[PDB]
Amino acid sequence: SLADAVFKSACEERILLAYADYNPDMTKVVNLFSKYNETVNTVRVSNDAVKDILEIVGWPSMPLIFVKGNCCGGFKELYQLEESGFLNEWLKEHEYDLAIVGGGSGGLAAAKEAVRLGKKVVCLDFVKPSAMGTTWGLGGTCVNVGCIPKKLMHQAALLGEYIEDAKKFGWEIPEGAIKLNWHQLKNAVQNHIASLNWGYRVQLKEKSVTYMNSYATFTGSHELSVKNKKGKVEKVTADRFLIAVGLRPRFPDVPGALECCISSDDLFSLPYNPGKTLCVGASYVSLECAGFLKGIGNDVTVMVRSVLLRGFDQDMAERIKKHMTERGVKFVQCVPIKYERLKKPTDSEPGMIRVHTMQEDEDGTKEVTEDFNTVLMAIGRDAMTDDLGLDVVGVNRAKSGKIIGRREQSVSCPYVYAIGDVLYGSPELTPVAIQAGKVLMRRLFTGSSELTEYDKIPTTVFTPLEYGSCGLSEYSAIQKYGKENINVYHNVFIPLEYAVTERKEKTHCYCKLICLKNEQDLILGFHILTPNAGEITQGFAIALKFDAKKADFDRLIGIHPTVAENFTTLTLVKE
Amino acid sequence: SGSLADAVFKSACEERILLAYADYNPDMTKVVNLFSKYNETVNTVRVSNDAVKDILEIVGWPSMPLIFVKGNCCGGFKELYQLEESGFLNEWLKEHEYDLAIVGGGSGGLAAAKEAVRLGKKVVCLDFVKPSAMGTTWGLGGTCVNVGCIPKKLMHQAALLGEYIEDAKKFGWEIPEGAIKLNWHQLKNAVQNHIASLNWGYRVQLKEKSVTYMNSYATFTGSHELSVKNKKGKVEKVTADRFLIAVGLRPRFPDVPGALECCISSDDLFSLPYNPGKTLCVGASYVSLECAGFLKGIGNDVTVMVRSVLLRGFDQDMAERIKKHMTERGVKFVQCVPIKYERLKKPTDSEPGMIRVHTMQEDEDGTKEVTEDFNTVLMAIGRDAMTDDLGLDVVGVNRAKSGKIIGRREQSVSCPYVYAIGDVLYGSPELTPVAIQAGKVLMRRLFTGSSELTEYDKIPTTVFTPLEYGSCGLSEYSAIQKYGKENINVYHNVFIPLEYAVTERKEKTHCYCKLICLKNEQDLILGFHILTPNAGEITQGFAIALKFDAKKADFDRLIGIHPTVAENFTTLTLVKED
Numbered sequence A: 001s002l003a004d005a006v007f008k009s010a011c012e013e014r015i016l017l018a019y020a021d022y023n024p025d026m027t028k029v030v031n032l033f034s035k036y037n038e039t040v041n042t043v044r045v046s047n048d049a050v051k052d053i054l055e056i057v058g059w060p061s062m063p064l065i066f067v068k069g070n071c072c073g074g075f076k077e078l079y080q081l082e083e084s085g086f087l088n089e090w091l092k093e094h095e096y097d098l099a100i101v102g103g104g105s106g107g108l109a110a111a112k113e114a115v116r117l118g119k120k121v122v123c124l125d126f127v128k129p130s131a132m133g134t135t136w137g138l139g140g141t142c143v144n145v146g147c148i149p150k151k152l153m154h155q156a157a158l159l160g161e162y163i164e165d166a167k168k169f170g171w172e173i174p175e176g177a178i179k180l181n182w183h184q185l186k187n188a189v190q191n192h193i194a195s196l197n198w199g200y201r202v203q204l205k206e207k208s209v210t211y212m213n214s215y216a217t218f219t220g221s222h223e224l225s226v227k228n229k230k231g232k233v234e235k236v237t238a239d240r241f242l243i244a245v246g247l248r249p250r251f252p253d254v255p256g257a258l259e260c261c262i263s264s265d266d267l268f269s270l271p272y273n274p275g276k277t278l279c280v281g282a283s284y285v286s287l288e289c290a291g292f293l294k295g296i297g298n299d300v301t302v303m304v305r306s307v308l309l310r311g312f313d314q315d316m317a318e319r320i321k322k323h324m325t326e327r328g329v330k331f332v333q334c335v336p337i338k339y340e341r342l343k344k345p346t347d348s349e350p351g352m353i354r355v356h357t358m359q360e361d362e363d364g365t366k367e368v369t370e371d372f373n374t375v376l377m378a379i380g381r382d383a384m385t386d387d388l389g390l391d392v393v394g395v396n397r398a399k400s401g402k403i404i405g406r407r408e409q410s411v412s413c414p415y416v417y418a419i420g421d422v423l424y425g426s427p428e429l430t431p432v433a434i435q436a437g438k439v440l441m442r443r444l445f446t447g448s449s450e451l452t453e454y455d456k457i458p459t460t461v462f463t464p465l466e467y468g469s470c471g472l473s474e475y476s477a478i479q480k481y482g483k484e485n486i487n488v489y490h491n492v493f494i495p496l497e498y499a500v501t502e503r504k505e506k507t508h509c510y511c512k513l514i515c516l517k518n519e520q521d522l523i524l525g526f527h528i529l530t531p532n533a534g535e536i537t538q539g540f541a542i543a544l545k546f547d548a549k550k551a552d553f554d555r556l557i558g559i560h561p562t563v564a565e566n567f568t569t570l571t572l573v574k575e
Numbered sequence B: 001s002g003s004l005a006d007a008v009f010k011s012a013c014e015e016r017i018l019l020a021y022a023d024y025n026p027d028m029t030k031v032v033n034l035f036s037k038y039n040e041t042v043n044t045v046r047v048s049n050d051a052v053k054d055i056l057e058i059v060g061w062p063s064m065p066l067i068f069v070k071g072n073c074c075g076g077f078k079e080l081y082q083l084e085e086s087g088f089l090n091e092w093l094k095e096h097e098y099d100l101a102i103v104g105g106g107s108g109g110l111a112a113a114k115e116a117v118r119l120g121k122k123v124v125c126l127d128f129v130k131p132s133a134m135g136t137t138w139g140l141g142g143t144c145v146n147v148g149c150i151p152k153k154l155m156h157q158a159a160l161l162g163e164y165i166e167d168a169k170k171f172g173w174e175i176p177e178g179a180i181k182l183n184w185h186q187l188k189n190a191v192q193n194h195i196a197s198l199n200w201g202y203r204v205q206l207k208e209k210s211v212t213y214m215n216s217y218a219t220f221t222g223s224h225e226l227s228v229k230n231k232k233g234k235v236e237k238v239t240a241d242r243f244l245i246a247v248g249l250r251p252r253f254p255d256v257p258g259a260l261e262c263c264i265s266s267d268d269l270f271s272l273p274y275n276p277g278k279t280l281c282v283g284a285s286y287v288s289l290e291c292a293g294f295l296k297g298i299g300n301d302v303t304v305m306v307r308s309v310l311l312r313g314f315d316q317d318m319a320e321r322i323k324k325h326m327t328e329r330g331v332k333f334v335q336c337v338p339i340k341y342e343r344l345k346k347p348t349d350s351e352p353g354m355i356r357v358h359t360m361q362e363d364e365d366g367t368k369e370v371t372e373d374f375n376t377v378l379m380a381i382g383r384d385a386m387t388d389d390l391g392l393d394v395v396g397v398n399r400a401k402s403g404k405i406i407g408r409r410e411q412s413v414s415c416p417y418v419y420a421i422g423d424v425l426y427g428s429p430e431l432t433p434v435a436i437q438a439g440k441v442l443m444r445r446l447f448t449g450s451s452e453l454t455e456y457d458k459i460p461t462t463v464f465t466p467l468e469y470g471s472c473g474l475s476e477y478s479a480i481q482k483y484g485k486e487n488i489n490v491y492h493n494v495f496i497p498l499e500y501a502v503t504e505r506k507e508k509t510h511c512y513c514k515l516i517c518l519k520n521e522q523d524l525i526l527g528f529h530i531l532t533p534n535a536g537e538i539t540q541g542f543a544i545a546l547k548f549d550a551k552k553a554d555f556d557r558l559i560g561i562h563p564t565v566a567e568n569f570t571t572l573t574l575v576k577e578d
């Protein structure tokens, strides 16, 4: 048989053995499953198809064993499961076909797709409060404390710059400095978040998915114990588990950090204008937040350890820095050594943090202080998986708390899967979680060979001036292929919308196309610094799925007038 | 066998007079002896049989034996003997002042001029702007720069910034309360100051790049001679080995009494010394709706009179959606055509006039004449080629029924050393980026001997209506007409741009996208359509999908950028069933 026949057979059949040619331990398998009154269906895989099948399930020798549509590997893996007693518990009936731990981007996407394929699904979501005590509804990081509130506050900051544009285009706006009222913005954002929480809660109920607002821990091979807000503990059993627990803001081992500094978990529901703010960190979260806080008129400082946007093209990173500097954000090469609280916040006004730094001159080191209203700790995001009981169900984790996959299947446990941010090496983006969820569900319950494509994923950093990208940085391309084999085509431009204004952005917009010279200027990556970078980058990202060349960009006809057409017309080679 | 295409075209670019023949060759000693008459060497090439059909397709001729003159494809012997017998060949083979004369200083003309001169050729560019009926005139850059896309997009942005002022309030910006008016004079000066900078830019760019600019209207007075007249009425003579016609079009006026006296055009709208006030837009083209749209957005009372359908050529589903939205935004649409325009007041000193517009309306008894008073009437019923006074008869360049030049690609079908690009080229889509690409590419064929062709299919557009409409490829109707309803899948969704989520905008109920797919070829994408803020920025990249025969599966395995409107193309599942 071919692949799809094998995977379909595997999805449908309760226990399937996939073989190339007659091997001794197939009898041993028959005899072992005979022990449990189980019937072992078999398939002669054709030799034309072995390699493909082996690559898809991510195992390296041929004889393959499936249990309830989950790939276990070979005999050693099976005998391990049997010897551990797991197989005996696995073969029993359970309450749910699938239990999902996490009600975020991935969780909810998986839940919706599973139930559309007619499976009994439970979804567990619980939000342990931040250190400041902040908590929120269903939907996960993106909905409550991630992309959706951040984009709204970015739009607030842009509408600031639009008010001034409106004057240059002839709109007679009554004279007077205009201030943004934090309470109005925050209520407007929180009201939308509240509508999405209800939306998801409804969507789950409407689709016959069981929701439990309860924090889940493995207390058995196929048993989660789940604790709700009241402290009530229930037991949930299932034939399969999806871990989509995501991450939480990282705090450093520094005195006062956890006492004095807020995180993105807290910023989007603050009962006060955060005032003179310090953003600690160089991640996209620090710069996005610093950006909009400046745009709504706060005094903003960013303290970075060494470089901005580690992982991103450093040319583009330096360009974001020059621009946000021109827009009045202060950058400083420090890491605080202590945070001291001077004033607690009220329900209407912010507090005061004293921030301690070591500063050098040519004569020695000074301990130096500086008083900020609010300090945003934004250095990263970690997996909080210590209290999940992954030891109980023998799910290996990386040094960080992230789960180690064979694709999305736990590398060590065949009926536990992970997607989204907690999957070791998964890019931490909402649309990736969703696609991983939707696609996994289609492999598990449909027996398709469809794989989430984790390469050449487009991003946008929503800095005051937006940065869109897909593919290699100029550095990575040069490191992997030589300098001699890379062409960079690039250009500056002025968005027409800015032409009649005196905006600082007129001197900062830039795009570059990274091309492999010795393979017909094949496009390895592209990068653009512009209004609406995300709207522009999305479509152009499909070019990389087809091994597009520069010639393909040059024979594409522009829409005039747009920023996007600039990618149609590049001729200048960087050095 | 013998030579392949690029060797032939390279040989043709380099050699003064080339004869390209197949394994098989006809009389073509007569031709040799003909060019021997002119002290010429006739270089020859055995084209390989592997290459004949390609080469024939590229130059757009049907028989094998091919003759080239000064890097121009003439056809076969009949065409050559015709040129000889007409005396043209004798004049062609002489030296001329310029390698190339370009008639038109617009999108195509200037693009061609820059590309020719980069390939080290002596080029003259001629541009003159005959005033509108109201007397309006403008500088270098053509329609786009002065009276087309550049001023239009700025006035659109003015209209959007209107809706942004209100958004700013819902996001918490404390804007002092009280109606906000847009001051027409400020907007118009801001636009005209930008146009002035582009005018200057282009004029300088030409001087810096060693291109001769003459602000003179050009007419063919010889096989290889333009006579050109400047503003002062001074007439000069310009000769060249080749000519590029990039004359563009001008607004159409109807044979209706008072139309030309009373109604402005886009030629006049962008420099009006007055707020146009209560406006009538006559026409259903993108020009009428774009202008009606921004005039509404800056707070004018706007009416659109359409003969029959909006945006003929465009997807009528999307057209009806634009109508419903612009209706919700206060634009009045009427199925009427004026039968007379009567001027009541002239525009004087920073104020508009009053036009009385006459219509036939039926009531419960029959048809009556009805009048209605508008401040300004924008005649926007299309654009025509004004090629009657160009002397194309003199150089025997065939024109279509409209004034447009008939091409064998961009070569005049009838004269081998005259070429046309942009709006005046019969069947060329009328867009700035097409003109530019046609110009740049032609120049690379003519002076480099490359086989590169401008790609005139699957061209993305955006209509900059109050809510922007972006598209590429077939409409739902065209796809159904060509393939059949049983073989078409239409995937579609509504969505709310996050930027609108906390507002009470009308647009929240109107944003829509659809993907038109050929069911029996793995949902191959024939077209896509989106109604959204920033439709142009979204459509551009997605348009490259159609250069690779993208399937729906390609859109589904593309990972979205969240949150953007664009990602909606990544997660379409709903099938339209009417």
Ligand SMILES: Cc1cc2nc3c(=O)[nH]c(=O)nc-3n(C[C@H](O)[C@H](O)[C@H](O)COP(=O)(O)OP(=O)(O)OC[C@H]3O[C@@H](n4cnc5c(N)ncnc54)[C@H](O)[C@@H]3O)c2cc1C
Pocket: A101, A102, A103, A104, A105, A106, A107, A124, A125, A126, A127, A128, A139, A140, A141, A142, A145, A146, A147, A150, A214, A215, A216, A217, A244, A245, A246, A247, A264, A285, A388, A419, A420, A421, A422, A427, A428, A429, A430, A431, A433, B561, B562, B563
């Ligand atoms: C400030 C910020 C801005 C961002 N901006 C963007 C952006 O613009 N675009 C973009 O694509 N991505 C963005 N991201 C990333 C995006 O939010 C994540 O990639 C995405 O939310 C990951 O979703 P997930 O399903 O993996 O996890 P989450 O959304 O974190 O879902 C996990 C859920 O599981 C719950 N949970 C944890 N443990 C348990 C347990 N034991 N039992 C039950 N429930 C549990 C958690 O409380 C949480 O609700 C941003 C992230 C942040 C923090």
Ligand SMILES: Cc1cc2nc3c(=O)[nH]c(=O)nc-3n(C[C@H](O)[C@H](O)[C@H](O)COP(=O)(O)OP(=O)(O)OC[C@H]3O[C@@H](n4cnc5c(N)ncnc54)[C@H](O)[C@@H]3O)c2cc1C
Pocket: A559, A560, A561, B103, B104, B105, B106, B107, B108, B109, B126, B127, B128, B129, B130, B141, B142, B143, B144, B147, B148, B149, B152, B216, B217, B218, B219, B246, B247, B248, B249, B266, B287, B390, B421, B422, B423, B424, B429, B430, B431, B432, B433, B435
């Ligand atoms: C209101 C409006 C909005 C538009 N919006 C868009 C849009 O958003 N996007 C887009 O892609 N396209 C748009 N277009 C179309 C675009 O302007 C044209 O497609 C483009 O300008 C055509 O370029 P061209 O070189 O063919 O002609 P033109 O730009 O018209 O250039 C012709 C020039 O030659 C001059 N000329 C004419 N005859 C002679 C002669 N005998 N001797 C010398 N000079 C002569 C003309 O006066 C003119 O200066 C718009 C058009 C209009 C009218």
Ligand SMILES: Nc1ncnc2c1ncn2[C@@H]1O[C@H](COP(=O)(O)OP(=O)(O)O)[C@@H](O)[C@H]1OP(=O)(O)O
Pocket: B254, B255, B282, B283, B284, B285, B306, B307, B308, B309, B310, B311, B312, B313, B337, B380, B381, B382, B383
């Ligand atoms: N004399 C006239 N009076 C009123 N409307 C007219 C007109 N001539 C053209 N139009 C309209 O003005 C627009 C532009 O004319 P066009 O000839 O450039 O359009 P098309 O793209 O159909 O070739 C069309 O909406 C057209 O309506 P019809 O499609 O019914 O012709």
